[PDB]
Each structure stands twice: as structure tokens, then as C-alpha cells.
């Protein structure tokens, strides 16, 4: 599914010389955001909230009402009028129908007749006459790498904010791009990069990682604080298995890390036995920090999931 198209794009990118894990994560974050994880290879002309969502200033040149009428027509499957407002008379879209014919396609959307002309010439693809080729995953990958290597200067290859600006001349969805960037930085380990260099099909293997219950792993300090305090509660902790105690410690360390605690000094039961509160500092300290977990959900919450979420949280 997404894994197959993501693996294909990772191989195409590394085959084109995008070898830096930092540059590759950035490239993958921009492509993932602009195509919703490589699942949307065609531009959507559907705007359900309002015309304020339409990101092209030029679309208002015929007044607010003509733009609202084109929006309703696009929602009914006739986006020609909206495409003409958004891209007509720009980027080589001279003839009627060009704006929609050359709508965005690909991972780093190719839009406008002149960009289909330039990309076609550079990649030996008949994109002007068969623009649909730009929405085919294989060609889409080659076109995204070309957009990246020709529109992003070397100095902006490692920064999500600068790369987004060099690509789009504006900063849209920076939060979502930053989140995708941090996920790719975690996935592109040395062995994953080595398997991409070797050209392996399933190179992006995640593999079993050590959980926070192992010494030296991210969250281990908070995990041991939680585990010690759970064992101190004795039979009153309501935990009937070592596995449930470990799961609860993992959930507690995660909540603690998310709320800014560096240490769990105390564990308190509350909400009629349904909640566990992790506390940093004495209970009478007005600077005391706190975090809470649902006891039932925490006893069955995977320690591998808790360890993954805490590691990402610390990396953020």
C-alpha cells in the first residue's frame, strides 16, 4: 500500500543521489505532505469550508461571488471554472481547458502547461500531450526528484521551512511537514540507508527495537521511576501480572515525558480508582508537576508503543 509507493520513492530518490538521511527525510516530508502519504497523486478542486481555503490570490479577480459559484461547480464534479480562476492565464495556461488539463499531479505537484513542458523535455516524457503520466507513481517519483534537485538550492536541502519556501514560495502546513520530517529522521537509520544504497525492495524494514525497560534506552529513567513506585504500592496497585505492571510503567513514563517531568517522585490513585497521577516534587510544592493515565487503558497499553511514542517525543 503506502509502504510499496514509499519504498519505490525512497529507492528513486537515493538512486538520484539524495544520499543524506537529513535531505532524504526533508524530501520525503514535503512529498508526503503534498500528496497525503503518497495516496493523492491528483489535485483536489474540492473545498468544503469556504473560498478562504483557496490558496491562489488570483482566483478572486472576478469577485467573491464568481469564486463561490466555481467552488460549488467543482464540488459537483465540474472544476473547469475553478481551475480557470486558480491557474488560467498563468504558467503557460493560455488556451481554455489548459488550467484543468495541467492541474497538479504527482508527489511534488506539477501544475501549469509550461512546467509540464520543462519536466517533459528534462525527463524525456511526453507530459505536454499525456499529462496523466505525471500522476503515475513511477514517473511521479522521477518528477518529484527533478523538482527537488532543480528548485531547492543545496543550502536549503536540510531545513523543512527553507525547502518548503524554495518549492512553493510560501509556508503552508509547516506543522504537518515538520511532524513528517521527524518521523522520517527516526526511520532513516544507517542500516535502512545502507539497504537503499544496495537497492533492496523492502530496505525500509523497521525491525524490533529495545523498549524503554532496557537500560540506556530513551525513557528508561522515567520507566524505572514509575516501575519502582508501582511495586511500592504493593497489592493495592491492582496489577495482577508483571506484564501489566510494565505496561502501566510505560504509559506513566510517556504521560510524564509529554507533561515535561524529568522524574516521577510519587504515584497517586484518584477518580475512584480509575486514574493514576505521576507527580514530580513534594505534594506541597506549588511548582509540583503532574501527569495522569487511565489505569485500565495503561495496564493493556503496549510497552513497544509507549517506547516508540516516548522516543519520538524526546526527539521533538
Author numbering: 1 to 316
The paper states:
Stenotrophomonas maltophilia expresses a type IV protein secretion system (T4SS) that promotes contact-dependent killing of other bacteria and does so partly by secreting the effector TfcB. Here, we report the structure of TfcB, comprising an N-terminal domain similar to the catalytic domain of glycosyl hydrolase (GH-19) chitinases and a C-terminal domain for recognition and translocation by the T4SS. Thus, TfcB is comprised of a fold similar to that of characterized GH-19 chitinases/endolysin.
As a result, we determined the structure of TfcB to 1.9 Å. There are two molecules of TfcB in the asymmetric unit. Structural overlay of TfcB to that of these GH-19 enzymes showed that residues Glu34 and Glu43 of TfcB align with the catalytic Glu residues of the well-characterized chitinases. However, Val111 aligns with the Ser/Thr residue of the conserved GH-19 catalytic triad.
